[PDB]
Design a protein around this ligand. Structure first.
Ligand SMILES: CCCCCCCCO[C@@H]1O[C@H](CO)[C@@H](O)[C@H](O)[C@H]1O
Ligand SMILES: CCCCCCCCO[C@@H]1O[C@H](CO)[C@@H](O)[C@H](O)[C@H]1O
Ligand SMILES: CCCCCCCCO[C@@H]1O[C@H](CO)[C@@H](O)[C@H](O)[C@H]1O
Ligand SMILES: CCCCCCCCO[C@@H]1O[C@H](CO)[C@@H](O)[C@H](O)[C@H]1O
Ligand SMILES: CCCCCCCCO[C@@H]1O[C@H](CO)[C@@H](O)[C@H](O)[C@H]1O
Ligand SMILES: CCCCCCCCO[C@@H]1O[C@H](CO)[C@@H](O)[C@H](O)[C@H]1O
Ligand SMILES: CCCCCCCCO[C@@H]1O[C@H](CO)[C@@H](O)[C@H](O)[C@H]1O
Ligand SMILES: CCCCCCCCO[C@@H]1O[C@H](CO)[C@@H](O)[C@H](O)[C@H]1O
Ligand SMILES: *C[C@@H](COC(=O)CCCC)OC(=O)CCCCC
Ligand SMILES: *C[C@@H](COC(=O)CCCC)OC(=O)CCCCC
Ligand SMILES: *C(=O)CCCCCCC
Ligand SMILES: *C(=O)CCCCCCC
Ligand code: NA
Ligand code: NA
Ligand code: NA
Lengths: 444, 450, 446
């Protein structure tokens, strides 16, 4: 028989996210290769190269092989273990109870030794159950690393495109501000301007100019992150990352049934498999409450004279049945069993915490995405109005019917609005990534 | 003998925090349930719910159970370990020393086997001292998690109230800016305005409007964090978290004597107990320099014929006193003892680092709190002057004695000042949390074991 | 024999950082005491005190000692292990084979017990090779912690200087803003001003005043970080941290050949030593495919009567040669060997990851530093233009027919620019730190 608890997966309720019933989302299908929806072949090539090259993923694959090797070793314990031996014991001395003379003694043995734990209460079965669950946990850990890797990479690519977009914006605004700085100098030098206007124009041109190397530094840091995520050195990136627009998804997002997310996410499965392994380990400990039945054997040759080894006259066999039971040391056995029970309770609570964290992450991703869409509508309006204002202010300054501060402020506001809108477009992109990461998108 | 060093807790000096003698603080009392002084029943409910629901606290209690179980196994080594066995050896072959004929041979044994390490140099006593200290470490780890959980929860609630407060401010400013934008449109349509005024007002309104969903998103993140902290799913949070004012404490903070903080913090006790355990482990290794004295026994039956087991003619007993000593392998013993001494040294330095980190955290919390109060005084003044300016600019713009940019700039400044003051009020709240977390308040004493 | 793979350090290509063939850098030598280039004696004394007092460094040295002790234990397995014993076995019962009567039995033994694994396939030598490499990894971990600690400390000191500089700038700007507010109130009181000017000036003053305690709190946080990094309590710091200018390095930075950084970095060596150890462990597992040859021994006394112990009549010796082989359990041995190989594949992939992270760190540090220099050029210009604008705006506001907003906006821009420039100066200093951290600076080879 097999003693100890018989594991049953927790009866975990499906995820419920009411917001997913609204129009930004499509619950009728889930895209597993979710990043392909951006229709960006550069991004797709990055992801393919990362899955082949990423070194953390290679570590995880190796850990899975290591777990399977451990399970394979334990699985042999279900059967007799038959090893081989040639040994002797040779000496001279008294033989207490036989003689007080110092006598020569010799014994020689050559043969097969067998050790067999008969698995009557399932200690070994439970060890294998545990090892098998831990191999499945390691597979789930690998899948989770793929989910996390793909999301990190797709996210970094967005950050790269964002920095490139923000640089383009900064440079376009810098050109507008260089044009008005030129105009302040021309009006000043024709006697219808002011040194104060030029100085203010110079200060704001320099502020804008200072943003450009900061954005370039951010783009470079993103490129270097991408290289490492691909398993590549910074100078050896294969994929051309010259500027392109930030990608977008204009269809409703195919998110499937949010109720499936806890079954899809590999981190949840890994934690469930760790729980299953810990539950089996309670059974391993439980079996020690019961007797241990074992059977040793020897087959081969035994002799007092080494010259006879291998002959018919020295053939020998032996069997060694044994039953052991903790008896008065059952207290120690019970202590170990309490320890296994505690470990299993820790694994259950840890599994439950992983569920809660997954539900938090998904709730956050959906809440953030809806709000990022809303925020973008306002920022687009802000940018449109700010451009029109700056255009009108420039006409009026040139024509002498407004003061330079009106134009300066309008230019400041145009840049601020256009850069905020860009950052919000990046946030939307990153929000898509956060949704698919939370849903357990992307693994093999 | 119980060999090896006798552990003595480090003579660590009391924390000294000079700033605590000032008017913001009350050293005459300490409040263990420190969050109650916010007089916020919703907060109190959240904390109490968290203590029964939080899953990380369940892990930590399980880890404590596990440490006790390890101790209980060690504790039994102080006595004879008496197990039971029924065994045989059955075979056919030569019997070296007895005969060279291949003969049948049988031996049967049935009885109690006893194994006993006489603990003459206290090796087992030191092992139990270590296990007992590690159980205490695990109790302190749970208490430190309670401290950390409560501070994190109270802080998250502040962040929620802050996002709600900032939303209210954004919407109040948005209303003012809608009125201004309407006025620009009216003046334009009267032929006494300008399209430039309207466009600038439209841009400002949209900027303020864009802030609202960002603040709403922050509030939802805070709500979801609170749910997990309570051990609840996001959609099953019961507690009504509809907006309320950010809580405040207007009496001097009851912080007790800062000299008690190192003794109160469970993280410092956890590290001290690990030090104690490591020092006991030096004693375990020191015992192996000395001989190990043991006594085995058998009581039951032994026979050559399985048929005689259980008969008086098969009764048997034996005792096996034994002394062993490492002798020429003392070099290995000494290597293990160097290893144990190095581990104890690591535990001591770790302990001292935890002390320093605790003193850093408390120093930071007190310095931050006094500066946050000072900061808020100036921001309150900024907000007041900024509202007066925006009101007067709006009057002047409507009458035609100031240009729109003067109004626009004043509206910008009003929002900037009000929002800054709200962030500073949240920082003050968070600063109170940081003070209490650093003082090690709020944990439940353990019943322990007997 | 010593079986299993014979470890060879990976043939990892040298780092290539093209941008270091530029003007801000001196590739002709590397300054190992890299922080001394700031010519800041207070900083220098912080570093020395940290090396003396930092408790994390103490933990790491203790871990190194523990790894060496482990190794020393393993090394004794190469020889016979000879222990000592005094024992007796006394009882009453049958003696299967010998007799069916219940007879009294007494036996006494006193001597040396020897156990010896003959290391014919190198199992034990592979164990020692592993343990030796893990002790070298512990040493590299300690050296990496020192690199990291020194960088963290130097960085924290720059942050402290930054907060003190920004506080100075805030207070200077506050003074200018108080003067402007006085003028608003005078102009109002002389009937050529406006209450609206005064209110806006008061709001501005309050805003700048609010920044001061925030910057002071940042400076105190940095002080307290510094104390811990020194191994000191916050109120006991032994180094005077009263305000001083942020340090600067005007000569080209001595960075050596960037191609050497992977050999200098202790984290890379620690990962390489863990890969060497895991490679040895494959050998340990490999050795179990082969027979294990052992020899036990006893030398001493054996008697039936206790009084004979130690006498020539009770002299006794024995030897126990043995050879064992897994035979039908070779499948278990093979499983363990697959596991060891997997563990060594993980170590190799971990080592390569550590190389990529180092190359990323160094690429980021050099890219950032060049761009931080460029950015500071623009910000210096911004500050200069902003100060001149604010002075001219104050002249114009006094000339008495311009709205205060022109002055207010110029004063906001002056403070914004000066503060931004200071932050950028801090970022340049922190960028130097990041460069040297990324190159493996801060530990000294013996
Ligand atoms: C992790 C929670 C552990 C609770 C253990 C309950 C499950 C079964 O455990 C065991 O199976 C044996 C069957 O003969 C019984 O004899 C044991 O005494 C019983 O407790
Ligand atoms: C006293 C008898 C004990 C059981 C004897 C061993 C029974 C079979 O044992 C099996 O032998 C096979 C080869 O023959 C091996 O390959 C297997 O690993 C082993 O389990
Ligand atoms: C050969 C005798 C085998 C008897 C079965 C072992 C004794 C079982 O003892 C059981 O152990 C558990 C310990 O946690 C307890 O929960 C049960 O109450 C107790 O009955
Ligand atoms: C076949 C063996 C006969 C001996 C039966 C031993 C059963 C005793 O059992 C154990 O002994 C101790 C009581 O002092 C405690 O550790 C346990 O509570 C008890 O279950
Ligand atoms: C024939 C039985 C085994 C031979 C044992 C070889 C004994 C040499 O062995 C050595 O003895 C030294 C004492 O001089 C000790 O210091 C060493 O630790 C031990 O390795
Ligand atoms: C088999 C019985 C022989 C027992 C001899 C015991 C000698 C114990 O001697 C002990 O050895 C330690 C190791 O060097 C020293 O540190 C102690 O000072 C010493 O008392
Ligand atoms: C029974 C004890 C076996 C001892 C093995 C002999 C010692 C071999 O030692 C070996 O020497 C070689 C040549 O110098 C080196 O290349 C090996 O790395 C080293 O381990
Ligand atoms: C005294 C020598 C005994 C002979 C032992 C023969 C061992 C056979 O070794 C075999 O290797 C196979 C590899 O394909 C595996 O299937 C098995 O684990 C094993 O039976
Ligand atoms: C597995 C345990 C408990 O289950 C059974 O009784 C099944 C019996 C199948 C042989 O029992 C054993 O295997 C031990 C035998 C108990 C007899 C007293
Ligand atoms: C690994 C090899 C190396 O040993 C030799 O080549 C001979 C020296 C050993 C005495 O060891 C073996 O595989 C030994 C083969 C022995 C065959 C009976
Ligand atoms: C419980 O399942 C025990 C397994 C029975 C196998 C046969 C024992 C002779
Ligand atoms: C590797 O072949 C090991 C050989 C060592 C020779 C010594 C034998 C006693
Ligand atoms: Na096995
Ligand atoms: Na025990
Ligand atoms: Na040893």
């Amino acid at each position: 028989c097999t003693v100890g608890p018989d594991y049953r997966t927790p009866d975990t309720a499906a995820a419920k996210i009411d917001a997913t019933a609204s129009k930004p989302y499509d619950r009728s299908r889930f895209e597993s290769l979710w990043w392909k929806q951006f229709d960006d072949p550069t991004l797709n090539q990055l992801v393919e190269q990362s899955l082949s090259g990423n070194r953390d993923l290679r570590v995880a694959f190796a850990r899975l092989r290591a777990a399977r090797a451990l399970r394979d070793d334990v699985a042999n314990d279900r059967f007799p273990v038959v090893t081989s031996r040639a040994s002797a014991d040779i000496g001279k001395g008294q033989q207490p109870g036989v003689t007080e003379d110092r006598v020569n003694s010799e014994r020689y043995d050559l043969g097969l030794d067998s050790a067999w734990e008969l698995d009557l209460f399932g200690r070994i079965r439970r060890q294998l159950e545990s090892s098998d669950a831990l191999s499945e946990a390691a597979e789930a850990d690998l899948q989770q690393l793929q989910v996390s890797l793909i999301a990190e990479l797709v996210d970094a690519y967005g950050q790269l495109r964002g920095a490139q977009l923000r640089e383009k914006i900064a440079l376009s605004n810098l050109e507008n501000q260089k044009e008005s700085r030129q105009l302040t100098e021309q009006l000043r030098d024709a006697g219808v301007g002011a040194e104060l206007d030029v100085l203010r124009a110079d200060a704001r041109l320099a502020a804008t100019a200072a943003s450009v190397p900061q954005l370039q530094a951010e783009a470079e840091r993103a490129r270097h992150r991408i290289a490492t995520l691909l398993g590549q050195r910074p100078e050896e990136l294969t994929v051309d990352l010259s500027p392109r627009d930030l990608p977008a998804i204009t269809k409703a997002l195919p998110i499937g049934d949010p109720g499936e997310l806890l079954r899809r996410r590999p981190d949840i499965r890994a934690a469930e498999r760790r729980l299953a392994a810990s539950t089996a380990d309670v059974g391993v400990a439980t079996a020690d409450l019961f007797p241990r039945v074992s059977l040793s054997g020897f087959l081969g040759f035994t002799a007092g004279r080494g010259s006879q080894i291998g002959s018919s006259a020295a053939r020998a066999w032996s069997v060694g049945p044994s039953i052991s039971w903790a008896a008065f040391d059952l207290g120690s056995v019970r202590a170990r069993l309490r320890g296994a029970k505690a470990d299993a309770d820790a694994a259950l609570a840890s599994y439950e915490q992983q569920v809660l964290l997954a539900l938090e992450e998904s709730a956050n991703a959906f809440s953030d995405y809806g709000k990022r869409q809303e925020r973008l509508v306002s920022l687009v309006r802000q940018s449109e109005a700010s451009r029109a204002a700056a255009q009108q202010a420039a006409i009026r300054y040139r024509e002498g019917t407004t003061d330079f501060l009106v134009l300066l402020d309008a230019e400041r506001e145009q840049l601020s609005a256009e850069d905020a809108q860009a950052q919000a477009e990046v946030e939307l992109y990153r929000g898509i990534v956060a949704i698919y990461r939370s849903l357990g998108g992307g693994w093999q």
